[PDB]
Amino acid sequence: AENPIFTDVFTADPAALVHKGRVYLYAGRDEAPDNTTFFVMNEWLVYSSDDMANWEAHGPGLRAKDFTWAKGDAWASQVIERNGKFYWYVTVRHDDTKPGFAIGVAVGDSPIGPFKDALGKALITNDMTTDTPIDWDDIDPSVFIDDDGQAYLFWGNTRPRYAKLKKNMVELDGPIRAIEGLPEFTEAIWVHKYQDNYYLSYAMGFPEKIGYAMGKSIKGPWVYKGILNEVAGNTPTNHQAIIEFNNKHYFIYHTGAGRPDGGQYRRSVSIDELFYNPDGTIKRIVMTTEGVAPNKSP
Ligand SMILES: [Ca+2]
């Protein structure tokens, strides 16, 4: 379970879920030939584990070009289960009909697919959010289903936003709302709940750290609580996912510590353990070479 956990490919922008006693881990595959130009990402890979230490590779689960309305760029994504189906929210570069990055959604009958575009068009297009002129604000989706059954889509670079999702998971319900209270917000929202607190962690500043805020409701208000993760080894992007599995908590992220020539466009998923303080704040992550111990259900 030494970090990075996969040595034969470069993996980035991790997301994870727990389904029938296995963790499923989703990540973009970095195919950039070096760290000199830009991200080259075409497909997302799927892995699974019953102990957080030994991982089964399932191969590509989805490709950016699977969305007929996308140019490419298999950017940050997240998968969630509802009512027996799996909804995969993706960042992709939209074709020129609606210039800029966008958020798509695919649907699958199992955690490993087969996945297909659930809409045949984008869920969020760049032109739906014009309070900033940049064309990469509509990236990095995070999805959450609250205890009352209301689902929510969070996203954004520069401008943090969320909206309710309909029960079908593929349609917005009501207004796109701006989120307040996240100082130095950059991108990469992850939302989770533990006991009676909600947590919104995010990439903060640039080069990126991870900051986080706590709320008593999924609607906020969000109260900033400080740095969750220092700048990650040899990468300016710091992209995280937090899950609870078998009575432990896991901070899944990426570094540029892989070989050969890991770096900003050739990243590697890593995992370390996450610990709560009694008051529900989170101890700052310690990023390690050793990673996590096996934690299989007895
Ligand atoms: Ca926009």
Side-chain angles (χ1 to χ4, degrees), residues 126 129 134 137-138 161:
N126 184 23
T129 50
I134 67 169
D137 62 316
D138 300 292
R161 299 153 184 148

CSV table of all heavy atoms in Angstrom, one decimal, residues 126 129 134 137-138 161, ligand 1:
chain,number,residue,atom,x,y,z
A,126,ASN,N,-20.9,26.1,-20.2
A,126,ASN,CA,-20.2,27.3,-19.7
A,126,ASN,C,-21.1,28.6,-19.7
A,126,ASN,O,-21.0,29.4,-18.7
A,126,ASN,CB,-19.0,27.6,-20.7
A,126,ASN,CG,-18.1,28.7,-20.3
A,126,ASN,OD1,-18.1,29.1,-19.1
A,126,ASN,ND2,-17.4,29.3,-21.2
A,129,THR,N,-23.3,30.0,-16.5
A,129,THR,CA,-22.7,30.6,-15.4
A,129,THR,C,-21.7,31.7,-16.0
A,129,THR,O,-20.6,31.4,-16.4
A,129,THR,CB,-21.8,29.6,-14.6
A,129,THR,OG1,-21.0,28.9,-15.5
A,129,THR,CG2,-22.7,28.7,-13.8
A,134,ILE,N,-14.0,33.6,-17.6
A,134,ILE,CA,-13.1,32.5,-17.9
A,134,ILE,C,-14.0,31.3,-18.5
A,134,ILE,O,-15.2,31.2,-18.2
A,134,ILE,CB,-12.3,32.0,-16.7
A,134,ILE,CG1,-13.2,31.3,-15.6
A,134,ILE,CG2,-11.4,33.1,-16.1
A,134,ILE,CD1,-12.4,30.6,-14.5
A,137,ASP,N,-14.5,27.7,-15.7
A,137,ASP,CA,-15.1,27.7,-14.3
A,137,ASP,C,-16.0,26.5,-14.0
A,137,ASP,O,-16.2,26.2,-12.9
A,137,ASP,CB,-15.9,29.0,-14.1
A,137,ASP,CG,-17.0,29.3,-15.1
A,137,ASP,OD1,-16.8,29.0,-16.3
A,137,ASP,OD2,-18.1,29.7,-14.7
A,138,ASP,N,-16.6,25.9,-15.1
A,138,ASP,CA,-17.6,24.9,-14.9
A,138,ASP,C,-16.9,23.5,-15.0
A,138,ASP,O,-17.1,22.7,-15.9
A,138,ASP,CB,-18.7,25.0,-15.9
A,138,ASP,CG,-19.4,26.3,-15.8
A,138,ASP,OD1,-20.1,26.5,-14.7
A,138,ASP,OD2,-19.2,27.2,-16.7
A,161,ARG,N,-20.0,26.9,-6.5
A,161,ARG,CA,-21.5,26.9,-6.7
A,161,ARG,C,-22.1,25.6,-6.3
A,161,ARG,O,-21.4,24.6,-6.3
A,161,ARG,CB,-21.8,27.2,-8.2
A,161,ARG,CG,-21.3,28.5,-8.7
A,161,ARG,CD,-21.1,28.4,-10.2
A,161,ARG,NE,-20.5,29.6,-10.8
A,161,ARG,CZ,-19.7,29.6,-11.9
A,161,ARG,NH1,-19.4,28.4,-12.4
A,161,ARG,NH2,-19.3,30.7,-12.3
B,1,CA,CA,-19.2,29.5,-16.9
